[PDB]
Amino acid sequence: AEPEHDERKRLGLKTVIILSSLYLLSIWVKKFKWAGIKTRKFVFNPPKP
Amino acid sequence: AEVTQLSNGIVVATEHNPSAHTASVGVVFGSGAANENPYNNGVSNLWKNIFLSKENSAVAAKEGLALSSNISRDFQSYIVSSLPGSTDKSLDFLNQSFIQQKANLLSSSNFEATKKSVLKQVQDFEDNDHPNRVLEHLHSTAFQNTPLSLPTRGTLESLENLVVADLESFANNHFLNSNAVVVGTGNIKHEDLVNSIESKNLSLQTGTKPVLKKKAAFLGSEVRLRDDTLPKAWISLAVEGEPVNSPNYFVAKLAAQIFGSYNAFEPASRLQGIKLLDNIQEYQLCDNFNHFSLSYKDSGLWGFSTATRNVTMIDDLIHFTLKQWNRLTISVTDTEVERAKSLLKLQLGQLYESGNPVNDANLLGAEVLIKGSKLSLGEAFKKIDAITVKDVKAWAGKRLWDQDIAIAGTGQIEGLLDYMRIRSDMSMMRW
Incomplete structure (x- = not known):
């Protein structure tokens, strides 16, 4: 019923390692690219009439 | 074209020019806004304003003398202009205000009338001089939490809380001899x-x-002062530049x-040879x-400013401006470098040699205070002409290519x- 069994699981191990790594790496890249907006600071000085 | 300077007790510097009609004398101190603190910021601007006050100014006017002063980041200067003959009466007014009246200019009626003027002054600046307000x-932000970040005119908050004791405190710490240049x-001669x-002795706080x-230090950052009620947009952008006395100045x-x-x-501006x-x-x-x-003692700023509707x-x-700057690292042409050489000489000329001695005084004092001597105009041209395309490319690859920037608008x-x-545009994609 599942002749591809052994091969399928081998390909799975490769696929899951790459995607896991890619996922972790993307988070780091995203945080870096966002740091300027994230730590951004505002100050309000009411304009005179 | 003579740079004469000799030291006896006080380091005296002069640059004589026969045909002049007038002559200017004064002292220039090796300390400006970059020496103040966030809280006494504006002290130097205050000094300048009392030194030019109605009282003190009326005294030199009777005598036929004119007053001028300028506050900068690395230095400060007090100057008295006169005719070629009264080159001595200026020296009297100079000593009279920096030793004798270093307590008469600070009365409780003068200081209060002066403080009220710099307050309407600095306020006016922040309310209307947008291009300078932005460059300031x-x-x-470029030099935040560091000396160069302090505005020369001082902040309205550190100003309205400044007292006479602060003036004295600053004066007794920077208006010293070892940090001065007369x-x-x-037209007057160095020996004149x-x-x-060297006639009038007295050291007055020597050894101090x-x-x-x-x-x-430079820090990639920005400060956005949005105001939708203004009719334009004023922005200034820059990378860390070169300090005075740098191989790449x-x-x-x-x-x-x-x-x-x-x-x-x-x-004519529209016709210039700028891509x-x-x-x-x-x-x-x-x-x-x-x-x-822009160059200073510890650092500098290389960039541009612009206004738009x-x-x-x-x-x-x-985007276009930053794409052009990318070229300095990879494709600047010989003719662009050459067009620059000519134009740099023309502007550097008009600065170092105008028909106004007061500008010469500031430039002379400022330079001798940082490098113990002045570079002759002719010596500059030789350096300017020696610049190759390879030099520009090496410099840009270090200061402009994929480097942090500072913004303000x-x-x-x-x-x-x-x-x-904006930051991403400091470079280009490649194979």
Whole structure:
């Protein structure tokens, strides 16, 4: 019923390692690219009439 | 074209020029706004204002003398202009105000009338001089929590809380001898002035040195002063430049000349040999712009400033300008470098040699205070002409390519994209 069994699981191990790594790496890249907006600071000085 | 300077007790510097009609004398101190603190910021500007006060100014006017002073970041200067004959009466007024009246200028009726003037002054600046207001803020964020970040005119808050004791405190720490240089420009000889000075003795606080601090550093950042009620958008952008007395002081100054300055309303300006003009003139991206290579003791700023009414295309203005700067690292041409050399000489000339001794005084004092001597105009040209395309390319690859920047702007700046967008344009994709 599942002749591809052994091969399928081998390909799975490769696929899951790459995607896991890619996922972790993307988070780091995203945080870096966002740091300027994230730590951004505002100050309000009411304009005179 | 003579740079004469000798030290006896006080370091005396002069630059004589026969045909002049007038002559100027004064002292220049090796300490300015970069020596103040966030809380006594504005002390130097205050001094300048009392030194020019109605009382003190009326005394020299009777005598036929004129007063002038300028506050900068690394230095400060007090100057008295006169005819070629009264080159001595200036030295009397100078000593009279810095030793005898260093307590008469600080009365409770003069200081209060002066303080009220600098307050309406600095306030007026922040309310209307947008381009300078922005350039001042550029230094503010670029060098934050460091000396160069302090505005020369001082902040309205550190100003209204400043007292006479602070003036004295600063004066007793920076208006010293080892941190001073007596300058003389106009027509008078080096040996003419040096005599009238070595005559009157008295050291007055000798051996004393000013306090030290922490070295100035650049930080990629920005400050956005949005104001939708203004009719334009004023922005200034820069990378860490070159300090005075740097091997690249000139390459940088030349690099800025390549893009130079522009004024969309002056017909001749539109015809200049700047490639950037082909891009910005199609949709009229700005009313004007001007590049610069500001230099100071510890650091500098290389970039440009611009003003625009095309508030919906600011990203193109910034994008094209930054694409042109990319070229300095990879494709600047020989003829662009050459066009720059000529134009740099022309502007450097008009600065070092105008028909006004007061400018000469400031330049002379400022230079001798940082490098113990002045570089002759002719010596500069030799260095300028020696610059090759390879030099510009090596410099840009270090200061411009993929380097942090500093930004500041006011007015209708909604169209000025985020930091990372601008920051990304400091380079190009390649295989």
